[PDB]
Amino acid sequence: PGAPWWKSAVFYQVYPRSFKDTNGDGIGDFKGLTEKLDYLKGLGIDAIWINPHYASPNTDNGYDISDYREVMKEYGTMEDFDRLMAELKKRGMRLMVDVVINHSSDQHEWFKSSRASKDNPYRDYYFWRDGKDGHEPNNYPSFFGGSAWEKDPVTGQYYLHYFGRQQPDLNWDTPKLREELYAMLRFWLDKGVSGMRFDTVATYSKTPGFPDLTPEQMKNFAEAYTQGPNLHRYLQEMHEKVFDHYDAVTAGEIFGAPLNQVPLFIDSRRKELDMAFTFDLIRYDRALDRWHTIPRTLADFRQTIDKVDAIAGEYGWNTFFLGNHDNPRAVSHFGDDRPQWREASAKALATVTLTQRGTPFIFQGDELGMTNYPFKTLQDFDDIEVKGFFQDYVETGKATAEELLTNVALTSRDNARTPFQWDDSANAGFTTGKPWLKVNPNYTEINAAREIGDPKSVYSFYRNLISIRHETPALSTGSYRDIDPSNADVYAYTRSQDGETYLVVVNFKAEPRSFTLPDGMHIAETLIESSSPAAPAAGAASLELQPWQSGIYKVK
């Protein structure tokens, strides 16, 4: 047969709010994204995944939807959305929208009705329960602060919200609710959308009776929330009633789920989702409280990739990303963002990103080498999640304001949300007004305009890597094999398909290193290298690597 277009595609994630503003209000919009399609096309992007673009009070920047069938006021009108669609099509590009159906805004008409009374027709579109022993129904904690249960004096019961208090969870146990969600998905799919990314898709099913989480589960409640007994039953139904009638690719954000359960979501034979967004890697050095970091090495990094790949099997498929809107900047996180190493390590990570088995997603700005932001006070963060950490850890006396700042500065989601750096004009050319989130001062050195015309820029390297990937089947659908899972210095692996085998060698140390190819393996040709003074001689049996050097070679 043949592999789907999404298995050989290179996606680009656009956070509209911080991509390109065109009316000076400081917030990115659709016209802004539409004006930059030539930029993405030139980069070689095949499809774009945009974060939530629906009507929202923005307590969680788009993830709290008040109307699934209207566009967010800040981004434009439905017409603007249609225009984005048409322009993407004119360039042969596809659009993947974000689907947020684990919860809705508390301003959604379903919730407004739901809270009116216990006998209301929409009561069960959400989860309402009586408190217990004078307190909340159970000990469920919220990702964004305090209890996952909020009492509503209108009825006296508590409603469930894994996330923000203004993000009540939708009740998937209710048939009419599921039917409404399916009809909503068809609304967008009928418009031609080519893909859907499902926000926290593993938390749709809630545990019957809502018993308390054990002390252990409390430590990792995110995992417990992914163990609903009707989860896959619901996913199979959605696929049967919706996706079976369209030709769109589905990608689930399987956050919190044990890696061993991932196959249940993506094995094609199961008819659930097409691709998986896993977080074992991107959160591989994150503490359980989600705001502290834990030192890891390349060995942990590669081994995690190892496991995630193995999980895909023969019928599953992974997406591969080193960054997104919920995590610190790739180069700062996995590379070395210091001035002398930023560019070298950003290129090294690009090589990794574009040579991994699965569908790679490039997060806006990483192709430029953008870094974390130099937060100075807690007021510099906008993220509701940080306010949650303050409520749960500072106001409770567990940590000082300074300790939260020091640590959250390295992990905060806002690191990835600062305005895209287009050029060195006012606010990096992002807006003519005041950006909703301050632009990183390093935009004077790191910006698209400066990198586009420079053959040695991080941008040009990405572009070239993307062309190489597009021209080399093995680099997308080829098998993957880690040459040495225990090596904590140089990441080396092969990609093979129909006889053609390629070698990827990336030095993760800011020091010279050597690499000996597996016995019998020799270099045939060098497709590309970064930070390398010279390609290896044809027939080479080993490689001498410069600090943070990366390379792709066809072997024999």
Structure tokens of 527? 């497709």
Rounded-to-integer distance, Cα 117 and Cα 140, Å:
24
29 is an annotated ligand-binding site residue: yes
Rounded-to-integer distance, Cα 11 and Cα 123, Å:
39
Q: How far is the CB of 20 from Ca ion (least distance, A)?
A: 8
Q: Which residue lies nearer to Ca ion by CB, 25 or 484? A: 25
**CA proximity to 348, closest of 491, 220, 555, 499:** 491
Q: Which residue lies nearer to Ca ion by CB, 192 or 433? A: 433
Rounded-to-integer distance, Cα 282 and Cα 270, Å:
26
Provide CB contacts within 8 A for 462, sequence distance 6+: 43, 350, 354, 362, 367
Q: How far is the CB of 14 from Ca ion (least distance, A)?
A: 14
Residues in the chain: 556
Q: Which residue lies nearer to Ca ion by CB, 26 or 335? A: 26
Judged by phi (left if over 0) then psi (alpha if -120 to 50, else beta), residue 290 lies in left
Applying CB under 5 A, does 80 fall inside the site for Ca ion? Answer: no
From residue 11 to residue 50, what is the string marking binding to Ca ion with x (rule CB under 5 A)?
----------x-x-x-x-x---------------------
58 is an annotated ligand-binding site residue: no
Q: How far is the CB of 26 from Ca ion (least distance, A)?
A: 7
21 is an annotated ligand-binding site residue: yes
Instruction: Give the residue numbers annotated as catalytic, written as ranges.
Output: 199, 253
Q: Which residue lies nearer to Ca ion by CB, 25 or 82? A: 25
Give 103-158 as a DSSP string.
Answer: B--TTSHHHHHHTT-TTSTTGGGB-EE--BTTB-SS-PBPTTSSBSEEEETTTTEE
Rounded-to-integer distance, Cα 512 and Cα 344, Å:
13
Rounded-to-integer distance, Cα 192 and Cα 308, Å:
31
Site for Ca ion in 469-508 (CB under 5 A): none
442 is an annotated ligand-binding site residue: no
Applying CB under 5 A, does 532 fall inside the site for Ca ion? Answer: no
Number of residues binding to Ca ion, judged by CB under 5 A: 5
Rounded-to-integer distance, Cα 342 and Cα 233, Å:
46
Q: Which residue lies nearer to Ca ion by CB, 419 or 547? A: 419
Three-state DSSP state, 333? helix
300 is an annotated ligand-binding site residue: no
Site for Ca ion in 252-271 (CB under 5 A): none
Q: How far is the CB of 21 from Ca ion (least distance, A)?
A: 4
Q: How far is the CB of 33 from Ca ion (least distance, A)?
A: 11
Binding-site positions = 21, 23, 25, 27, 29
Q: Which residues would be at the binding site for Ca ion (CB under 5 A)?
A: 21, 23, 25, 27, 29
Binding-site positions for Ca(2+) = 21, 23, 25, 27, 29
